[PDB]
PDB file of C-alpha atoms in Angstrom:
ATOM      1  CA  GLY A   1      -0.887  17.101  20.829  1.00 53.81           C
ATOM      2  CA  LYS A   2      -0.559  15.475  24.385  1.00 56.82           C
ATOM      3  CA  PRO A   3       1.068  17.397  27.022  1.00 56.66           C
ATOM      4  CA  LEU A   4       4.330  16.319  27.182  1.00 61.63           C
ATOM      5  CA  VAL A   5       5.952  15.691  30.559  1.00 60.16           C
ATOM      6  CA  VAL A   6       9.965  15.346  31.481  1.00 60.27           C
ATOM      7  CA  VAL A   7      11.592  14.546  34.682  1.00 64.46           C
ATOM      8  CA  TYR A   8      15.070  14.823  34.809  1.00 64.63           C
ATOM      9  CA  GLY A   9      16.892  12.466  37.408  1.00 65.49           C
ATOM     10  CA  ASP A  10      19.040   9.534  38.350  1.00 65.74           C
ATOM     11  CA  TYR A  11      18.425   5.958  39.798  1.00 62.24           C
ATOM     12  CA  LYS A  12      21.013   6.764  42.578  1.00 60.66           C
ATOM     13  CA  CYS A  13      19.777  10.141  43.430  1.00 61.25           C
ATOM     14  CA  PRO A  14      17.953  10.068  46.644  1.00 60.20           C
ATOM     15  CA  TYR A  15      15.755  13.104  45.485  1.00 59.62           C
ATOM     16  CA  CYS A  16      15.038  11.796  42.691  1.00 62.86           C
ATOM     17  CA  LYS A  17      13.307   8.250  45.172  1.00 61.26           C
ATOM     18  CA  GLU A  18      11.958  11.039  47.112  1.00 62.47           C
ATOM     19  CA  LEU A  19      10.006  12.108  43.947  1.00 63.07           C
ATOM     20  CA  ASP A  20       8.744   8.599  42.682  1.00 63.27           C
ATOM     21  CA  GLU A  21       7.419   8.370  46.193  1.00 63.96           C
ATOM     22  CA  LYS A  22       4.977  11.433  46.697  1.00 63.03           C
ATOM     23  CA  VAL A  23       4.194  12.158  42.546  1.00 65.15           C
ATOM     24  CA  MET A  24       4.130   8.915  39.967  1.00 66.31           C
ATOM     25  CA  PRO A  25       1.383   7.068  41.662  1.00 66.14           C
ATOM     26  CA  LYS A  26      -1.175  10.189  41.088  1.00 66.99           C
ATOM     27  CA  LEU A  27       0.185  10.802  38.188  1.00 66.59           C
ATOM     28  CA  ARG A  28       0.780   7.912  36.888  1.00 67.74           C
ATOM     29  CA  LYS A  29      -3.476   7.109  37.704  1.00 68.25           C
ATOM     30  CA  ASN A  30      -4.874  10.169  36.656  1.00 67.64           C
ATOM     31  CA  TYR A  31      -2.424  11.112  33.339  1.00 65.35           C
ATOM     32  CA  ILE A  32       0.179   8.821  32.771  1.00 63.98           C
ATOM     33  CA  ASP A  33      -1.769   5.228  32.542  1.00 63.75           C
ATOM     34  CA  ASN A  34      -5.411   6.522  30.892  1.00 64.09           C
ATOM     35  CA  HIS A  35      -3.132   8.079  28.405  1.00 65.46           C
ATOM     36  CA  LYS A  36      -3.583  12.058  28.987  1.00 62.06           C
ATOM     37  CA  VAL A  37       0.437  12.767  28.693  1.00 59.57           C
ATOM     38  CA  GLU A  38       3.623  11.847  27.199  1.00 63.31           C
ATOM     39  CA  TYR A  39       6.256  10.543  30.399  1.00 65.17           C
ATOM     40  CA  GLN A  40       9.813  10.937  29.539  1.00 64.82           C
ATOM     41  CA  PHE A  41      13.010  10.410  32.273  1.00 65.51           C
ATOM     42  CA  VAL A  42      15.853  11.448  31.542  1.00 64.56           C
ATOM     43  CA  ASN A  43      18.151   9.848  32.849  1.00 62.59           C
ATOM     44  CA  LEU A  44      22.028  11.658  33.603  1.00 60.85           C
ATOM     45  CA  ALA A  45      23.896   8.702  34.472  1.00 65.58           C
ATOM     46  CA  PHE A  46      26.367  11.028  36.911  1.00 66.73           C
ATOM     47  CA  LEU A  47      26.249   9.511  40.285  1.00 63.93           C
ATOM     48  CA  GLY A  48      28.757   6.583  39.239  1.00 65.25           C
ATOM     49  CA  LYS A  49      30.226   3.808  36.690  1.00 68.01           C
ATOM     50  CA  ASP A  50      26.852   1.855  37.563  1.00 69.12           C
ATOM     51  CA  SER A  51      24.593   4.829  36.720  1.00 67.21           C
ATOM     52  CA  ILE A  52      24.584   4.313  33.254  1.00 65.72           C
ATOM     53  CA  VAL A  53      24.096   0.625  33.795  1.00 63.78           C
ATOM     54  CA  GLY A  54      20.784   1.059  35.240  1.00 61.58           C
ATOM     55  CA  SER A  55      19.915   3.541  32.092  1.00 62.21           C
ATOM     56  CA  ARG A  56      20.440   1.179  29.785  1.00 62.81           C
ATOM     57  CA  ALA A  57      18.368  -1.575  31.626  1.00 63.52           C
ATOM     58  CA  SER A  58      15.754   0.986  32.142  1.00 65.49           C
ATOM     59  CA  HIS A  59      15.375   2.065  28.151  1.00 67.12           C
ATOM     60  CA  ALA A  60      15.341  -1.271  27.637  1.00 66.83           C
ATOM     61  CA  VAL A  61      12.473  -2.241  29.480  1.00 67.66           C
ATOM     62  CA  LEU A  62      10.753   0.844  28.260  1.00 68.57           C
ATOM     63  CA  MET A  63      11.253   0.465  24.710  1.00 66.53           C
ATOM     64  CA  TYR A  64      10.501  -3.823  24.658  1.00 67.21           C
ATOM     65  CA  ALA A  65       7.762  -3.748  27.378  1.00 62.59           C
ATOM     66  CA  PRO A  66       6.359  -0.008  28.082  1.00 59.66           C
ATOM     67  CA  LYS A  67       3.134  -1.198  29.757  1.00 62.04           C
ATOM     68  CA  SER A  68       5.389  -2.627  32.905  1.00 61.58           C
ATOM     69  CA  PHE A  69       8.162   0.811  32.588  1.00 64.71           C
ATOM     70  CA  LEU A  70       6.415   2.493  35.525  1.00 66.38           C
ATOM     71  CA  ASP A  71       6.442  -0.287  37.755  1.00 65.04           C
ATOM     72  CA  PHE A  72      10.259  -1.379  36.758  1.00 64.76           C
ATOM     73  CA  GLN A  73      11.345   2.255  37.869  1.00 65.99           C
ATOM     74  CA  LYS A  74       8.886   2.326  40.638  1.00 64.63           C
ATOM     75  CA  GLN A  75      10.927  -0.951  41.899  1.00 62.12           C
ATOM     76  CA  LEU A  76      14.248  -0.112  41.024  1.00 59.85           C
ATOM     77  CA  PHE A  77      14.033   3.079  42.975  1.00 60.84           C
ATOM     78  CA  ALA A  78      13.018   1.650  46.114  1.00 59.18           C
ATOM     79  CA  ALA A  79      16.185  -0.681  46.077  1.00 59.00           C
ATOM     80  CA  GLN A  80      18.187   2.140  46.120  1.00 61.47           C
ATOM     81  CA  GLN A  81      21.331   2.096  48.355  1.00 60.50           C
ATOM     82  CA  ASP A  82      23.700   4.559  49.506  1.00 62.34           C
ATOM     83  CA  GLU A  83      24.796   6.559  46.425  1.00 63.31           C
ATOM     84  CA  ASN A  84      28.419   5.531  46.667  1.00 63.52           C
ATOM     85  CA  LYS A  85      27.995   2.503  46.165  1.00 65.98           C
ATOM     86  CA  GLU A  86      28.014   0.675  42.631  1.00 63.60           C
ATOM     87  CA  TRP A  87      24.985  -0.869  43.719  1.00 63.65           C
ATOM     88  CA  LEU A  88      23.216  -0.914  39.939  1.00 65.92           C
ATOM     89  CA  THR A  89      25.320  -4.234  38.955  1.00 66.06           C
ATOM     90  CA  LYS A  90      23.952  -6.568  35.985  1.00 69.21           C
ATOM     91  CA  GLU A  91      22.881  -8.962  39.157  1.00 70.33           C
ATOM     92  CA  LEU A  92      20.310  -6.623  40.619  1.00 71.28           C
ATOM     93  CA  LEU A  93      19.228  -5.189  37.115  1.00 69.02           C
ATOM     94  CA  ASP A  94      18.833  -8.989  36.057  1.00 69.67           C
ATOM     95  CA  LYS A  95      16.927  -9.892  38.953  1.00 66.26           C
ATOM     96  CA  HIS A  96      14.519  -6.611  38.785  1.00 65.87           C
ATOM     97  CA  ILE A  97      13.400  -7.230  35.348  1.00 66.50           C
ATOM     98  CA  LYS A  98      12.829 -11.249  36.276  1.00 66.23           C
ATOM     99  CA  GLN A  99      10.345  -9.481  38.680  1.00 66.45           C
ATOM    100  CA  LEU A 100       8.097  -8.067  36.070  1.00 66.31           C
ATOM    101  CA  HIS A 101       7.557 -11.618  35.392  1.00 67.85           C
ATOM    102  CA  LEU A 102       7.343 -10.724  31.213  1.00 65.45           C
ATOM    103  CA  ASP A 103       7.112 -13.743  29.098  1.00 62.85           C
ATOM    104  CA  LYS A 104      10.429 -15.660  28.726  1.00 64.05           C
ATOM    105  CA  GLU A 105      11.482 -14.447  24.928  1.00 62.34           C
ATOM    106  CA  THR A 106      10.715 -10.744  26.154  1.00 60.44           C
ATOM    107  CA  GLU A 107      12.735 -10.889  29.194  1.00 61.41           C
ATOM    108  CA  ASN A 108      15.563 -12.753  27.508  1.00 57.75           C
ATOM    109  CA  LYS A 109      15.878  -9.628  24.604  1.00 60.62           C
ATOM    110  CA  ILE A 110      15.795  -6.776  27.360  1.00 60.48           C
ATOM    111  CA  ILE A 111      18.590  -8.740  29.319  1.00 59.92           C
ATOM    112  CA  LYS A 112      20.266  -8.885  26.126  1.00 64.01           C
ATOM    113  CA  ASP A 113      19.725  -5.529  24.587  1.00 59.88           C
ATOM    114  CA  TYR A 114      20.810  -3.630  27.463  1.00 60.96           C
ATOM    115  CA  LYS A 115      24.550  -5.747  27.721  1.00 60.14           C
ATOM    116  CA  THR A 116      25.184  -5.435  23.896  1.00 58.64           C
ATOM    117  CA  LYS A 117      27.085  -2.242  23.408  1.00 60.21           C
ATOM    118  CA  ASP A 118      25.790   0.360  20.584  1.00 62.71           C
ATOM    119  CA  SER A 119      21.774  -1.491  21.010  1.00 64.06           C
ATOM    120  CA  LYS A 120      18.744   0.762  20.906  1.00 66.01           C
ATOM    121  CA  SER A 121      19.073   0.357  24.502  1.00 63.96           C
ATOM    122  CA  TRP A 122      22.321   1.335  24.803  1.00 65.81           C
ATOM    123  CA  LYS A 123      22.527   4.311  22.295  1.00 65.79           C
ATOM    124  CA  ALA A 124      19.417   5.363  24.220  1.00 67.59           C
ATOM    125  CA  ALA A 125      21.353   5.989  27.620  1.00 63.04           C
ATOM    126  CA  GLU A 126      23.646   8.076  25.955  1.00 65.21           C
ATOM    127  CA  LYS A 127      21.464  10.444  24.603  1.00 66.87           C
ATOM    128  CA  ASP A 128      19.968  11.215  27.819  1.00 63.90           C
ATOM    129  CA  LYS A 129      23.243  12.690  28.960  1.00 62.25           C
ATOM    130  CA  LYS A 130      23.207  15.055  25.754  1.00 62.28           C
ATOM    131  CA  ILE A 131      19.378  16.215  26.244  1.00 67.24           C
ATOM    132  CA  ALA A 132      20.163  17.267  29.712  1.00 68.16           C
ATOM    133  CA  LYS A 133      23.674  18.897  28.856  1.00 72.03           C
ATOM    134  CA  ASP A 134      21.770  20.826  25.574  1.00 71.28           C
ATOM    135  CA  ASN A 135      18.673  21.648  27.741  1.00 72.86           C
ATOM    136  CA  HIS A 136      20.857  22.867  30.503  1.00 74.66           C
ATOM    137  CA  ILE A 137      19.657  20.894  33.088  1.00 73.85           C
ATOM    138  CA  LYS A 138      21.677  21.933  36.279  1.00 74.20           C
ATOM    139  CA  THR A 139      20.375  19.993  39.313  1.00 78.63           C
ATOM    140  CA  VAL A 140      17.915  17.064  39.738  1.00 75.70           C
ATOM    141  CA  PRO A 141      15.171  16.220  40.041  1.00 74.17           C
ATOM    142  CA  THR A 142      13.662  18.726  37.875  1.00 75.88           C
ATOM    143  CA  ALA A 143      10.223  18.564  36.068  1.00 74.99           C
ATOM    144  CA  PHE A 144       8.622  20.452  32.782  1.00 73.32           C
ATOM    145  CA  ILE A 145       5.628  19.629  31.127  1.00 75.47           C
ATOM    146  CA  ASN A 146       5.592  21.045  27.416  1.00 75.33           C
ATOM    147  CA  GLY A 147       8.558  22.675  28.694  1.00 78.04           C
ATOM    148  CA  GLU A 148       7.477  24.473  31.670  1.00 76.07           C
ATOM    149  CA  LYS A 149       9.012  24.290  34.742  1.00 75.36           C
ATOM    150  CA  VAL A 150       6.842  22.694  37.476  1.00 76.25           C
ATOM    151  CA  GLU A 151       6.961  24.870  40.795  1.00 79.68           C
ATOM    152  CA  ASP A 152       7.343  22.198  43.410  1.00 80.64           C
ATOM    153  CA  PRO A 153       8.755  18.888  41.686  1.00 78.91           C
ATOM    154  CA  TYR A 154       7.453  16.820  44.863  1.00 76.68           C
ATOM    155  CA  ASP A 155       4.097  17.917  44.839  1.00 78.57           C
ATOM    156  CA  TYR A 156       1.216  16.137  42.137  1.00 79.27           C
ATOM    157  CA  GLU A 157      -0.838  19.028  42.570  1.00 79.46           C
ATOM    158  CA  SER A 158       1.573  21.742  41.183  1.00 81.47           C
ATOM    159  CA  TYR A 159       2.022  18.915  37.953  1.00 81.41           C
ATOM    160  CA  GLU A 160      -1.932  18.869  37.739  1.00 81.92           C
ATOM    161  CA  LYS A 161      -1.554  23.185  38.290  1.00 81.39           C
ATOM    162  CA  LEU A 162      -0.111  22.697  34.713  1.00 79.09           C
ATOM    163  CA  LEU A 163      -2.166  20.432  32.976  1.00 77.44           C
ATOM    164  CA  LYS A 164      -5.457  21.299  33.808  1.00 77.53           C
TER     165      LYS A 164
END
């Protein structure tokens, strides 16, 4: 079927922020938004106790407002602070969710889901760490297309090469 592009990372990882900045704009316009590939972000949530919280919110946005997901990712990476700070607080995440300007009830649904223990967004966040584990993902950021490694994950043309 459609090629599958997987990017492993963490919202607190600085290099992952670089990837988002250099790659996503082009990959999104050309392959993701026109539905040419399935895009998946697996969050290792390994840079602090707030990492997993950021991941839950991200998964709630993805499941309830998929068409706003890439904007959310881009905007959250842009607000990245020192990785030693637990900057991914509920106040910041709620602020980011509301910036998506979604309809009030979806907004509330997303905000309540990621804060609710064992919710679908809660579970998705935990599963991400297991996926990275079972796939033996050592460092981040790393990207694969149908299980094939992207030679230079910071270069759009490198993904493009695997998709041509």
